[PDB]
Design a protein around this ligand. Structure first.
Ligand SMILES: NC(=O)c1ccc[n+]([C@@H]2O[C@H](COP(=O)([O-])OP(=O)(O)OC[C@H]3O[C@@H](n4cnc5c(N)ncnc54)[C@H](OP(=O)(O)O)[C@@H]3O)[C@@H](O)[C@H]2O)c1
Ligand SMILES: O=c1ccn([C@@H]2O[C@H](COP(=O)(O)OP(=O)(O)O)[C@@H](O)[C@H]2O)c(=O)[nH]1
Lengths: 329, 327, 327, 329, 329, 327
């Protein structure tokens, strides 16, 4: 059908929530020649291998902190999706160096190995927590994003493309709150943990995130930070539609948590280009051979935003009602 | 007090470094002051400049853990000022900035714990709050490492704190010096970015003073922020060179319009004092601490629910004339 | 005794790990129990599960010596259970298994000696005796490193011992659980390898108990082996799901027919006790030891010249009914 | 004459007993273009250079623990023979990590460097002590064997072949007992150290081992563990034919020593294929592109063994009498 | 005009005294396609970028102790000039390991990266202090010189050439005495630091050194140690012509300082070839494919020197009078 | 004194090593002598040769810091004799020579300081003075590292000194042995380089004696040089095999005609004693020292302004007959 046919793809952190959904989508909707899962845990890999049991799959035990392992794993790969990461904010506050080794040094290693093996396209997953970050996790992702964007300056016998995909909370992520709220009410809940009233968070489904990454692959030139237009939901309605029969206590705010998440910093608007269903944050730096981010590879046109624009979760027009939420298993 | 104590300063040959060393020699009884940095040229010139037997120079890189392990032997206080701070160069050389600022912080922490240092103060920047540029992001990572380092409880107790302030009036590579280089020479154009641009301003000497004061009242874990004035860049021009044309070049790479010192999202962690703030740790140390009362028995009060210490809404600014009283 | 002592368990989020932590909290006065492992998901879930102030979680890899050096500060006892144990995955990712199991053992040993740990027990496996698969070979290398580590005689004395046992009834990824996943669901075929296949069987709780008992009587250098029953796989089928068809798939990669616990070639090193064996070190420590008498004054006797503790000639087996009394 | 002509060969541990014999054989019987000796000791290399003084020789000082050194040394090499190792069983029991660094990490490094330089064929030397091992040395060799076999899965622009050659004790090896027994009786012996009566060990000559490695090069597909059919000798007759004029005291059994050495584990028979003068143990794992180990490159046919077969030193039919032994200087 | 046109050049330590002069010369007199400055300090690089502000320039922050950084920086480079170093003799005596890491390991890393990226020509800067050295700095440079010369033995798909350029004190170097003497008399001098009467040092201008390096590029075969014929000046006349109005105290001799610097050791004469304006010290070792150092690439002929020759600063015929010295700003 | 002290010798299986070990066992009360080297063959043969319970053998490389850290635990004196010394092989394998001799010195120093060794003596060579070959250059770098290491002043004080002497009569790989291998066999040609060639000559036993004496009087920082005779190579021929033809092959790679022991450029640093010299450090230690008076209260005098201790102008030579009285 398209660009993914006959291609070999490797995804770091492939056993994760995004990873399994992405792998499933690629196997179902493309004629990819091979899909390589690269992660550390033998348990999750053994079970994922049984779950998919697809001969197009390959499982490599390995750490993104291990450059030599990455060099060997990326051999013969055409496309690399970087989803490996330590993302638990509070655990990242208590174990800062671990988050740094995995998220930052991990990014640097993947970049190095992708260049060495002449990969064609690379997309690293980012987070809104990386825009004007306050927590350690967010700062490591910002460093990662900067590394990937800057990697486009390089120019070997083959010019590898590196882009970033940034979006917010995933509805009911592997460790999200949705899957947490359902476990409570299920195990006979009598109180739900809440943080703040005016709280706000962008929301997108796992499948939409995956589809967004794949579409970004088709339109990317390299160096872009892709941001999808997604609705916002106040935590108030979230708990009511997932447990209206039990009360909620305003527990203490987690370490390093924001009230509202930023998607596009006000100070970076001048780099932002708006499109129909997404935004593109252009590089702050200039490369050897510039790119016209105004027109994607899919011939889509984008227009600069307002010099004062700022994609925040509280100044958004899209809001998902308690209904469709329940429509998300 | 540094009374007959041994102090080591990473990046000691830099602007902050030389000023700090001068102050320590002149105002304390430190028995030894160690400069740890890479450049043999600057260290040779500094040695001749500070021809004092209390000085000791170690050529070394903060990316070199073994070298730091050796240099920090017998040290009581460590001031960490080594860094790559050029924002645009950091955007073009991100991994280099990460190696020096982030891994450098990790190595300093490791070497300080191993040598049982008593107190450590790392220098931060306002660019580390709600950062948008790479330099700022590495400094935020550095700050987090130093704050978190307080959880260790080995043999000798080691305290780690951070000092965060803005632009240093006429710093090494700063703008003021850049303009004094244009005014004293046949100029005609004053490079400018925006118009609403604002920044916090502190002098090199005030920075050094604040670090010294921070050492005396730190418990370990604080990010100390001094109350300093803000100044619109449309005044620093009508001061360093009035009656002169200024062309609006525009915003620079990874640059903000206003710098933040204390994020609104962290106000609840902030404690106000007469002339400074303390941003408390986001984590809980096995051995808790009360930051409401410094070692100097100074009392601090929590701040308003939506407090925002920014260079745009500062309740104090510098005068275009008092600005020249620094140069 | 763990009386107000600090204990750290590598791979603490695993099957053995969670069971061990529960036992220590409930049956001893350990002041602190530290979990050292890589996964933030399992540690976050375990923290909520074991919401106890005596717990402490460190994200870390046993391949990271610096991280272990830090995490083992102030620890008295270290239980080493971190490992890559999936035989076929280890055959396809040999260097990964070697890095974790072998280098991991070397790093743990190094960090324990540096932090002056008192006692260390590493978990082994019957697959490490006369091994044929890679996993088994790395565990044998790990066992040798831990036994040899006893030759060190620095500041504080550190004892290192190994605990070796077989298949853990319904372990994480085991077969029993795999069958309980087939029986409770629309099944029709029970995957089987051989017919003469046999294995030793010990419960998770018995494993944890044996480790605790090993700590109390170890001198350092022993490979402790518990006397446990054997069970032919043609019974584990006529128990977990009788009246059901079982297809003979065949032997798996790097798999044996019978597992060995004490090799005939090492019998001369074995000492028998009422309910366990001690395989003495092959080397002579500068500071000798008498393994015939444990710390618990238990007496052990040498074994027959051609003794062979295998899962095929075991003088005790599990009943197809007592087998279900575990599940 | 054959496959070795005009080829560049590098042998790690080339100054050793196997190494010197192998180098001598290659120089004498082939038109190899260049032979590189890679080892650590300047003494043995300087003397070996004087002993051979052949312009086709090249001597590289280097450690197999040093990956960067190996990468540089294997540049331009077509065939790599891996014989470097720490093999003294008791010393390996007292210095386990050293044996592991050299034997295991050394194997990993050689593999990495051979792949990087696109070597064509690689043979690593193994030992019967690596089959159902009880000592540390044997376990490290088993890990090494597993690494080399597994290295065949890789597939770069050039598919390097990796096979293993496994055999027992070498008659009068550099540190063997034969050369030990002759030094005793020579220095006026009056007592010979013995371990156990029923003891048993496979025996092969240095020259036969070398010839076997070279022949394996001609028939290998990559992934095989070559095992030669060799006779067995009880230690009883060994001491009598090498010192019948002096007594022997049953000294204590060395640390980590077996009574009988295994060549092919009973649990691996199902992988074993018998031939006229040798056996082939097939990989336990399956590669991308399978190989028909039933037919060697020399068109030799092999048949599966008995599902209960086990090549041990005590169940062997071949036994060398005290005569031919003395015929081995 | 010549060999440098359309070529990409990288100079380590490019922000230094030699570095800026070399870069300036290459930009002014050649049609080089790109010039890369590789050094650690962001301050000197930012200011050098403003000073030259030439689009043909590229600035890489990096350390020669960092192999991975060098591998990335030398990608696409044709010529590499190695000028990075720690050269302060007394500081090198007090910080020996630092000097060793930068000068020796730095040399090894540059060589490794140049080979990996198939650079065509490489010239490392040496010093007369490296001939029969007595101080640590000089010993590290001798080790460096030996590494570069030996690197010519290697032979990959592309045979990179490595040569060395050795000369003495640079008139008024970044930290020299000339710039020191002018600062004293300027800041009202009343006493000048002197070491010894019979002192002697070779002298060459920065511009001559740069021109010599560039000319060496045109004539080199690889493996040579280029030495320029330069005059000698006693320290007596140096202080008088730069400050005859103030006295001088015979301060203590710096740590590790010689009285006279050697250019060509007497024991290496047999390797030396004399030319009109320079000398060539041939390799002490023999390569695979020899070179005829008797004839440069510029068809210049050289003749062997006297078996007892020795280029010292005190047995030189060329001597610069106090006049021309002042002619050097 | 080595009275019940623990001594470790890197490169202990070498010529110097075996002689040193024999002397220490026979003439001192050292409680333990540790051999640290790489080769299992030589160590196994040496163990059988020196079947003495006071011996301990560690397989290890001086390029391996972690391994040295472990092996030097509990050591009081460290003799560093590990090296790659073949001049022409070092010319062809420069980085290997650099790794062993230079990095090896740095690792030994690091491990000695960490384990609080009391005294360390590193072996140098006359080829390290005004060197022309790579081997000599690495040894000069090694010497400088050891001298400089004395600036450290951590917990336990560690002294580092160097012992420098020339060719060892009939050393492992030397010429004398090479000739004894030609004389005892059907020879006819005696390989020769030059004619004016000269060298210093010391016996293995005199070297070992000098090291032992150096330990007793060292303060740390000295390069000890013994007063030894010189011998023209035109005599070593008319001794090891007279009435035989010698072909003039010529100068070898990186070889000098005369070796220097004390450079004229360093005379001012030299102090003369009855039978040896001390070359003082070029640097000033924070804690100064008076090398004019050894620990043995021996007095040394400065030397002449242009002193040059070379093998060509030596005031003493060996007799062609007394030369054979060594063999
Ligand atoms: N399982 C059996 O049937 C069996 C039988 C005989 C003996 N044993 C012994 O029991 C021990 C533990 O077995 P188990 O069943 O409890 O295994 P498990 O359930 O797989 O737990 C092992 C744990 O080790 C951690 N780990 C893996 N690699 C690590 C690394 N590189 N650094 C740090 N932590 C790492 C993993 O946690 P993270 O993913 O969070 O890192 C994992 O949870 C083994 O060592 C084995 O010798 C087990
Ligand atoms: O001092 C000794 C050493 C060894 N052996 C025996 O000789 C055989 C070979 O020993 P060696 O050290 O030559 O080789 P290894 O089998 O340990 O590789 C073994 O079966 C030992 O039992 C012996 O009788 N006396």
């Amino acid at each position: 059908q398209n660009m993914l046919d006959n291609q070999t793809i490797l995804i770091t952190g492939g056993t994760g929530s995004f990873g399994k959904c992405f792998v499933r989508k690629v196997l179902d909707t493309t004629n990819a020649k091979k899909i390589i899962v690269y992660s550390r845990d033998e348990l999750k890999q053994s079970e994922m291998a049984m779950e998919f049991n697809d001969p197009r799959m390959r499982f490599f035990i390995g750490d993104v902190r291990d450059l030599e392992r990455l060099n060997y794993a990326l051999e013969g790969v055409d496309i690399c999706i970087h989803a490996a990461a330590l993302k638990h904010v509070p655990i990242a506050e208590y174990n800062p160096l671990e988050c740094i080794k995995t998220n930052i040094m991990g990014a640097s290693n993947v970049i190095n190995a992708c260049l060495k093996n002449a990969i064609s396209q690379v997309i690293a997953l980012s987070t809104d927590k990386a825009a004007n970050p306050i927590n350690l996790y967010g700062a490591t992702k910002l460093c990662s994003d900067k590394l990937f964007v800057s990697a486009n300056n390089f120019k070997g016998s083959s010019q590898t493309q590196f882009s970033v995909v940034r979006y917010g909370n995933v509805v009911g992520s592997r460790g999200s709150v949705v899957p947490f709220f359902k476990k409570l009410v299920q195990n006979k809940a009598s109180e739900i943990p809440i943080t703040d009233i005016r709280m706000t968070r962008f929301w997108i489904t796992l499948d939409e995130g995956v589809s967004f990454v794949l579409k970004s692959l088709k339109r990317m030139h390299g160096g872009e930070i892709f941001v999808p237009k997604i609705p916002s939901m106040k935590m108030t309605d979230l708990a009511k539609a997932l447990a209206p029969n039990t009360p909620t206590k305003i527990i203490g705010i987690r370490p390093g948590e924001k009230l509202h998440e930023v998607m596009i910093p006000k100070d970076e608007s001048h780099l932002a280009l708006e499109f129909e269903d997404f935004f593109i944050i252009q590089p702050t730096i200039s490369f050897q051979t510039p790119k016209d981010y105004t027109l994607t590879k899919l011939h889509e046109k984008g227009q600069k935003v307002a010099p004062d624009f700022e994609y925040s979760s509280h100044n958004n027009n899209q809001w998902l009602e308690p209904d469709d939420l329940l429509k998300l298993l």
